Each structure stands twice: as structure tokens, then as C-alpha cells.
Design a protein around this nucleic acid. Structure first.
Length: 668
RNA sequence: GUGCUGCUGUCUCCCAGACGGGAGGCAGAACUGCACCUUCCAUCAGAGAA
DNA sequence: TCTCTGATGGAAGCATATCGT
DNA sequence: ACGATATG
């Protein structure tokens, strides 16, 4: 399934819900401990502080004694088998408990008929009642039945709770056990600590379901706010939620499949009404505030099978056979940078209208009609200011370490002395004084000036959204990455200056780190949204993206795979299929003649090539986008660089590793 | 609702101390702008910086 | 030596089937 | 037809 989540806030939570939350957490922790003890194996427990304790077998045995297991050793085998079955450690086919929570009825409640029912077994064929297929029962349930026959399986839970809530507690605790056990299983493969639930330290989602996993809830919508009604055993509690711009103007109607169909509005630029289905809700507490996690299923946009066959045809190497798309697909190719956010080129199969002609494998040529650059310079002055301040912070950190060395040592090395005067002093823009006492005073004055300039820059980067120039603000721009670099450099400089007096801090630059992470996440989301919007506006169904997996680069800001994966996921959710293309020599090869050209370094936005013995120039980013699209459509028909080695008599032997090289080589 | 995301006034804590920096609490003023699947866990590494 | 990511994992975000009234 | 478990 496909999930999307958000959170809503509830302000005046009654005492009954707080009691339910605390009791659910307590019984969940008890369930963690009980299952781990039934496993009968020592394990490491980590508390809030961080210290690790090795829980001995005696603690396990006495906890089982407290639960009701007077002789755990006598029933050690069956207890171990049941505990392993609950943790999904048996073979996935013919599982004792398809869902872990389903084990509560035979574990906690008295007078339970679980384990003696054959109604859902597939052997029940009607076209008898006495066909008792209890011989093929699972070991997990068979051990469970045996222990109840011993009269010791129904444990004394720390607090009385309804069967439905116990199911949610089992769900959370067993999912935590399954998450932990796999990590521990990997630990012994190399040749893992345990964290328990807490009300506020390590909270769990107290879940309310509509089919048995937790108490039922009735979610409605009034005005512009949700209304959650939890059916607690004590009574019905009605909760109102603070209105959210995520679920703006919501309308909800109960369906016939125990689900709520929510229709709302997410953004503000458009009035598009997203539709989702809610079947389970989650309650959490953080910073003394109670939140509800609305995790709703949604239907991704339908993708035509012809798009799939076209992607399969185009992604395959030339030395292969795949069916032709045979339809009028749309292929949009982009490259990712930081001075421009990205550049795109759009083409349609089977059309040529006064555009950059590109061959298509086993088809006619195509002309790129729409070519453009999205995201870049918003205001030149602001970008220049961020660049200057980032360089100033960089050279300030260098100068501060050099000054700290100079004050104590009293002398400088030949390399450092030349480096300081030639590079660091002009970069930090601070006059140099020999007296070390007030040298730190001048340094502090310069740092204060830097902080004031940074505050002014940030205030401008905030006022971009709150002036009459609100409409001219682009969706994304190069100022995001520059501001991220400036934040990193300023954090670095402040961290160096704060320890100038050295010849820790539990909190240090937490505001700066939080701002850096939030700005990074927002920049990623805005870039993904801009790419998706550009792809959708042109009607493109195939997207060829430069594979950036192979300073002033995106790699210094994000993981190489993270951006790519996010874009793939969003494009697929919007019913667009995307492929990553090898970006080698894309920025250095002309898209007109497929020849090496000149990429200017004084102005990195201009690419020079030769056509008909007359030097032409073009934009170096649309050139890369068109090269990516041409490479995708031609199925790597032409290579630029060949890896080879010399054996003898000046005759180089071509090295063949990738399949693309093999296909091209046999075509010549 | 979480962020982009700040300003003014005032107060508290911390690190140098007399040039300064960091972390927070309330009260106001301007703003109707853009985007948003998230929760929890364990191991191993990259960074930087004393 | 210490913090903070960051990698790369792991677990999650319900549905049908009867009897009994 | 809806509640109470119980199991794919």
C-alpha cells in the first residue's frame, strides 16, 4: 500500500485519555519485558541516561514468577517456541500468528476459544463441521494451548485493560521486538541493546483501529477542523483538533469497508483536493503536548502500460531486443545543479518542429520544443552577500586557529606565516596586530560585525515572503544552497570562536543546527515539487535525469542517493516514470554535433563548440539536459571515452566491463 | 500541525571577562506568502574541532 | 576524546469468517 | 443486520 502522514494537535485532552495513554505505555513495556524474558536469553538494556545493563537469567526467572510462571524451566521449551512464534520467527508460510496482536486472546483473557476454530482454514470447503483439522496445527498455537492446559498461561497484567487496547499494546510491543531482533540477528552475523517504551522518552503510537486493533474511533470534520471521537470502555470522549493547513477544509464520509474517506486541500497556490482513506489513528505525546498521527492511504496516479514498455525499451542496451513504444510518448530530460536549480528539455516522439534535432533508436528524429531553466538567482545582491559572508567565515576560522597557535607558541612556521598574510588576512578582512591581548578584542569585534551582517541577510531572506514583492518570489532559487553553505560556515566559525580561550556544553548552536536541518529539508521538498510540477505541466510521462551519484555541489549538502530516491518516489506517485542516465561527458560534449567543446570557467553558464568551422556558444545547462535526453533516447548509441590498455607493438586493447561498451564495440 | 522564519521590548541560564558569543522564557508589532508521508530502533562509518 | 549526521538496514501505519441474537 | 470474538 501507499501511505501519507500528517499530524494534528489536540489541546484539552481529558484525564481519561491521559490515563489510557499511560496505561497503554505501561502494559506495552510490560509486554516487551515479558516477551524478552520468555525468549530466555540474556540481553543488554539501555536506560534514559545511556548506561547498559546485562540482565541476568535470575531477573527473567523471577519476573516470570511474578507474571505467574511458577516453574518457567519446566515449560522453557514451549515458552521459547511461543515467544519465537509471536516475533514472526517461524517460516512465513503457515504462520501461527499472521498478526502478532492476535496472540493476546490466548495469553491474557480468561475463557478464550482461540486455537479451537477452523472457520477461516482454507480446508473448509462448502458446495462440513466434523472435519477437525487440528493435526496440522502450528507449533506456536499448539504450545499456547499446552501452556493454558498447564493453567499458567493467563498472566496477571499490571493494570486491567480491555481486549481491544491489549491488541494495540501487543502490536506496538511486538513491532518493536521484531525491529530489535533483526538488528541483533545482523549483529551476530558480523561475529544490540534494548530500549523500552516510555511515556515521554521513547513514546509509541497508541493506535485506535476499526477492526479490532485498539478501540474504535469515529472521525468527523466540522468547519475546517477534524473531530476525533474515541470509544473508550469508560465512555465516549469527543476531541476537537486545532485546524491544520495540511487537512485544510476537510470533508469526511464513512465508507462500507470500515474506513473514512477524507477529501481536503493541501497547498495554497491551487485548489486541488487530495483524497485519502483513514483506517488507523495514532496518539503520541511530546513536550507535554498530545498529537494525533493521521496516516492515510492514497491511490497513486495511474501509469499507462505504454509508458512502462517505453521505459523498458529505452533503458535497455543496443545489443538487446525490446518492443517499441509505438505511441506518442513524452520524454523530459533534466540535470541537477546548485547555481541553477535544474534545467529541462522536453521532446515528443514522432515530431520535428524547428528544434534541436536528436536521433531516436529505431525511430525518426525528435525536436526539443520546450527547453528551460528553473530555479536560480533571485536577487544578485543577496547571493553575493551570502557568498562573501561564507568566504569570510571560512577564512575567519582559519585565522582564528592561526592566531590561537601564534598567541601560545609565539612564533609561526614559514608556510603558515606566508599563508596568513597572503590569504587569511585579506579573506577575513581584519587588520593584523602583534599584541595578543587586544588581538582577541579586534577578533571579537569582527565576529560581532559578521553576526550583524548574517542577521541582516537572514532578515532579508525572510522578508522575501513578506513584502509587495511576494509574487515575484520563485518556488526555489539558488539562495537556498548558498544560505545552507553560509549556515555551515557560520556554525563552524562560531564553534571555533567559542573555544578561543582554550589553551562540555550540553546545548551548543542548537538553533543553528535546527535551522540548517529544517532549511535543508524544505529546500529538498521545494526542489522535488518544482521538478514534479515542471514534468506535469509539459505532459511528460518519461523523465531522464542525470545520475548525480557519479564546495559548490549538491554532494556536499545531501547524500547522492537521497535526492534521486525522493524524486523517483514523487514522480512515480504522480504517475511519471523516471530513469537515471549516465552523466559522463554530458557537460563537455555538444548536443548538436556530438563533439567535444569548450566549457568556459570564467562564465560557467556558457558552452562553446564548433559547427561548420564557426564557433558557436549555448547555455551549458540546457546543453547538459539535451545531452541527457539524447543519450537516453539513443540507448547509448555513441560513446565519447573508451577505456583501454597497451599490450604490445603500440596497439591498444579496449577494456570491456559495462554492457554499453560491448554493444557499441560490435556495432563498429 | 510541523517548517521555510524572522523583528521589537523585557527577563533568565551558560562560556570569556570588560571585545564579545551561545541556550532559553513571556509580551507585543508587521505577514496572509510557499511546500509538506511520518513514527520508533540497533550497529557501522564520514565530517569537524579542540 | 565528543557530537552530529549519515548508511543501511529493521519494524509499522487491517480484512474476512462465522455464530448468536 | 449487528455484536463478539477469531483468524487470513
Amino acid at each position: 500500500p501507499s501511505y501519507k502522514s500528517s499530524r494534528v494537535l489536540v489541546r484539552d485532552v481529558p484525564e481519561e485519555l491521559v490515563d489510557h495513554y499511560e496505561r497503554s505505555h505501561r502494559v506495552a513495556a510490560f509486554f516487551m519485558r515479558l516477551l524478552l524474558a520468555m525468549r530466555r536469553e540474556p540481553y543488554s538494556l539501555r536506560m534514559r541516561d545511556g548506561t547498559e545493563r546485562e540482565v541476568d537469567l535470575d531477573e527473567t526467572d523471577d519476573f516470570l514468577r511474578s507474571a505467574g510462571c511458577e516453574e518457567p524451566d519446566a515449560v522453557s521449551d514451549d515458552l521459547r517456541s511461543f515467544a519465537l512464534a509471536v516475533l514472526h520467527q517461524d517460516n512465513p508460510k503457515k504462520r501461527a500468528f499472521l498478526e502478532s496482536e492476535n496472540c493476546v486472546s490466548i495469553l491474557c483473557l480468561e475463557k478464550s476459544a482461540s486455537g479451537t476454530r477452523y472457520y477461516k482454514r482454507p480446508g473448509y470447503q462448502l458446495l462440513l463441521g466434523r472435519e477437525l483439522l487440528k493435526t496440522d496445527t502450528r507449533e506456536g498455537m499448539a504450545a499456547a494451548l499446552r501452556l493454558r492446559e498447564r493453567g499458567v498461561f493467563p498472566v496477571s497484567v499490571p493494570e486491567h485493560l480491555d481486549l481491544d487496547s491489549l491488541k494495540a499494546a501487543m502490536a506496538s510491543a511486538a513491532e518493536r521486538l521484531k525491529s530489535w531482533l533483526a538488528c541483533n540477528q545482523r549483529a551476530v552475523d558480523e561475529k544490540a541493546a534494548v530500549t523500552l517504551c516510555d511515556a515521554d522518552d521513547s513514546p509509541i503510537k497508541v493506535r485506535f483501529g476499526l477492526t479490532g486493533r485498539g478501540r474504535k474511533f469515529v472521525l468527523s470534520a466540522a468547519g475546517s477542523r477534524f473531530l476525533i471521537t474515541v470509544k473508550l470502555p469508560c465512555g465516549d470522549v469527543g476531541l476537537t483538533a486545532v485546524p491544520s493547513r495540511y487537512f485544510w477544509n476537510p470533508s469526511v464520509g464513512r465508507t462500507t469497508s470500515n474506513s473514512f474517506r477524507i477529501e481536503f486541500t493541501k497547498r495554497t497556490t491551487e485548489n486541488r483536493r487530495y483524497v485519502g482513506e483513514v483506517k488507523e489513528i495514532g496518539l503520541v505525546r511530546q513536550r507535554g503536548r498530545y498529537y494525533f498521527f493521521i496516516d492515510y492511504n492514497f491511490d497513486p496516479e495511474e501509469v499507462s502500460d505504454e509508458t512502462k514498455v517505453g521505459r523498458a525499451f529505452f533503458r535497455a542496451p543496443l545489443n538487446e531486443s525490446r518492443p517499441k513504444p509505438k505511441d506518442k510518448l513524452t520524454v523530459m530530460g533534466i540535470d541537477l545543479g546548485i547555481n541553477p536549480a535544474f534545467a529541462f528539455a522536453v521532446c515528443t516522439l514522432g515530431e520535428c518542429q524547428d528544434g534541436i534535432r536528436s536521433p531516436v533508436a529505431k525511430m525518426e528524429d525528435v525536436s526539443f520544443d520546450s527547453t528551460g531553466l528553473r530555479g536560480g538567482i533571485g536577487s544578485q545582491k543577496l547571493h553575493r552577500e551570502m557568498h562573501n559572508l561564507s568566504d569570510r567565515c571560512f577564512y575567519g576560522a582559519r585565522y582564528i586557529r592561526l592566531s590561537k597557535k601564534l598567541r601560545d607558541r609565539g612564533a609561526l612556521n614559514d608556510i603558515e606565516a606566508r599563508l596568513l598574510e597572503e590569504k587569511y588576512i585579506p579573506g577575513f578582512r581584519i587588520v593584523h596586530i602583534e599584541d595578543a591581548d587586544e588581538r582577541r578584542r579586534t577578533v571579537g569585534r569582527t565576529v560581532k560585525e559578521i553576526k550583524q551582517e548574517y542577521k541582516r541577510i537572514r532578515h532579508q531572506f525572510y522578508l522575501r515572503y513578506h513584502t509587495s514583492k511576494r509574487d515575484r518570489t520563485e518556488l526555489i532559487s539558488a539562495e537556498y544552497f548558498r544560505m545552507l553553505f553560509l549556515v555551515k560556515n557560520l556554525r563552524n566559525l562560531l564553534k571555533s570562536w567559542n573555544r578561543y580561550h582554550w589553551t562540555g556544553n550540553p546545548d551548543e548552536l542548537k538553533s543553528y543546527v535546527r535551522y540548517y536541518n529544517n532549511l535543508r529539508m524544505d529546500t529538498l521538498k521545494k526542489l522535488t515539487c518544482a521538478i514534479v510540477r515542471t514534468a506535469k505541466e509539459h505532459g511528460a510521462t518519461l523523465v531522464a535525469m542525470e545520475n548525480i551519484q557519479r564546495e559548490n555541489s549538491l554532494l556536499s549538502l545531501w547524500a547522492p542517493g537521497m535526492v534521486l530516491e525522493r524524486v523517483e518516489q514523487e514522480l512515480k506517485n504522480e504517475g511519471i516514470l523516471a530513469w537515471e542516465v549516465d552523466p559522463r561527458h554530458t557537460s563537455q560534449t555538444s548536443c548538436i554535433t556530438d563533439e567535444f567543446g569548450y566549457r568556459s570557467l570564467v562564465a560557467k553558464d556558457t558552452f562553446y563548440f564548433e559547427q561548420d568551422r564557426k564557433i558557436h556558444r549555448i547555455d551549458a545547462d540546457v546543453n547538459a539536459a539535451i545531452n541527457i535526453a539524447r543519450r537516453f533516447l539513443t540507448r547509448y548509441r555513441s560513446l565519447t571515452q573508451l577505456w583501454a590498455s597497451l599490450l604490445d607493438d603500440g596497439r591498444y586493447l579496449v577494456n570491456v566491463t559495462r554492457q554499453h561498451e560491448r554493444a557499441y564495440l560490435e556495432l563498429q
